[PDB]
Design a protein around this ligand. Structure first.
Ligand SMILES: C[n+]1cn([C@@H]2O[C@H](COP(=O)(O)OP(=O)(O)OP(=O)(O)O)[C@@H](O)[C@H]2O)c2nc(N)[nH]c(=O)c21
Ligand SMILES: C[S@@+](CC[C@H](N)C(=O)[O-])C[C@H]1O[C@@H](n2cnc3c(N)ncnc32)[C@H](O)[C@@H]1O
Ligand SMILES: [Mg+2]
Length: 259
């Protein structure tokens, strides 16, 4: 059993007041006061981020940890925060974004955020059974939290396998994907296998809540995976009992228009 497995048990052992205080302590949070109401009322002319996902991917790129270029696929696009982010980047030529939609799942938000015309959104699509196609950059932000760590491990394993399938079609593709439960040993095994064939490493973004162990794998970086995970587990355990609140920052505004 791993340090992260213990963290998950400690998390589930929090009382409600402990949990809600722990969840946001010391994390960056975008200010979505305006963006949320614009989306609620159905405004389509807006470039404020359609979700909290945009600033996460932006941070990864600003840090130099991802390469976003060429023909991009967004697997599990949800509202589309990553799709709109990618579409606004000059090195990106097109975005093919796929998400399952349906009951209890986010459908793509339709806005004029810069480069929207270069995105082909397709909802009602299961990416786990969809045959891969050519792409220069493969993104996947899939991984639904579960109180059950074994379920999170299995959901993570399916994402890593999907990425192996997209790399089999596109061996030279840039990859960035969510690893929901990197602390699970079955996930560590799959990541080692991925890293030994494709390179890459794991990083934590500062916008992820403390209630999730999610980390992001990118082929553009390197680093011992076990060490990366254990450093993050300790950080998450050390924040229990922290009284600092979240740190509020402006939300990404990409502007509007076609490219
Ligand atoms: C609501 N809640 C969640 N957790 C734990 O925190 C993890 C994440 O729970 P979460 O509520 O922070 O994320 P969610 O599952 O809603 O996904 P989101 O839509 O992206 O926000 C869960 O899998 C549980 O392990 C919780 N743990 C405790 N102790 N008490 C709680 O009320 C509680
Ligand atoms: C957390 S969202 C990604 C957030 C996104 N990156 C953003 O910035 O808004 C992950 C999405 O993947 C979708 N999803 C989960 N399983 C899927 C599947 N098998 N096929 C397609 N989409 C799936 C979920 O509905 C969810 O909306
Ligand atoms: Mg919740």
């Amino acid at each position: 059993m791993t340090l992260g497995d213990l963290w998950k048990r400690r998390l589930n052992n929090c009382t409600k007041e402990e949990f809600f205080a722990y969840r946001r302590t010391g994390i960056l949070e975008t200010e979505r006061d305006k963006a949320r109401e614009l989306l609620r009322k159905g405004e389509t002319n807006m470039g404020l981020a359609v979700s909290r996902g945009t600033a996460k991917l932006a941070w990864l790129e600003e840090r130099g940890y991802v390469n976003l270029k060429g023909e991009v696929v967004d697997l599990g696009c949800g509202r589309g925060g990553w799709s709109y982010y990618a579409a606004s980047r000059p090195a990106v030529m097109g975005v093919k974004a796929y998400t399952i939609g349906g009951k209890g799942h986010e459908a793509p938000k339709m806005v004029t955020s810069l480069g929207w015309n270069l995105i082909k959104f397709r909802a009602g699509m299961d990416v786990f059974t969809m045959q891969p196609h050519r792409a220069d950059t493969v993104m996947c932000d899939i991984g639904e939290s579960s109180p059950d760590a074994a379920i999170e491990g299995e959901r993570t394993r399916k994402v890593i396998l999907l990425m192996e399938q997209w790399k089999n079609r596109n061996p030279s593709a840039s990859c960035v994907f969510k690893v929901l439960a990197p602390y699970r040993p079955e996930v560590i095994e799959a990541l080692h296998r991925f890293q030994l064939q494709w390179g890459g490493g794991l990083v934590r973004t500062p916008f992820s809540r403390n209630s999730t162990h999610e980390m992001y794998y990118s082929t553009a970086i390197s680093g011992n995976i076990v060490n990366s995970v254990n450093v993050q587990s300790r950080k998450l355990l050390a924040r229990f009992g922290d009284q600092r609140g979240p740190i509020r920052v402006p939300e990404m505004d990409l502007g509007v228009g076609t490219r």
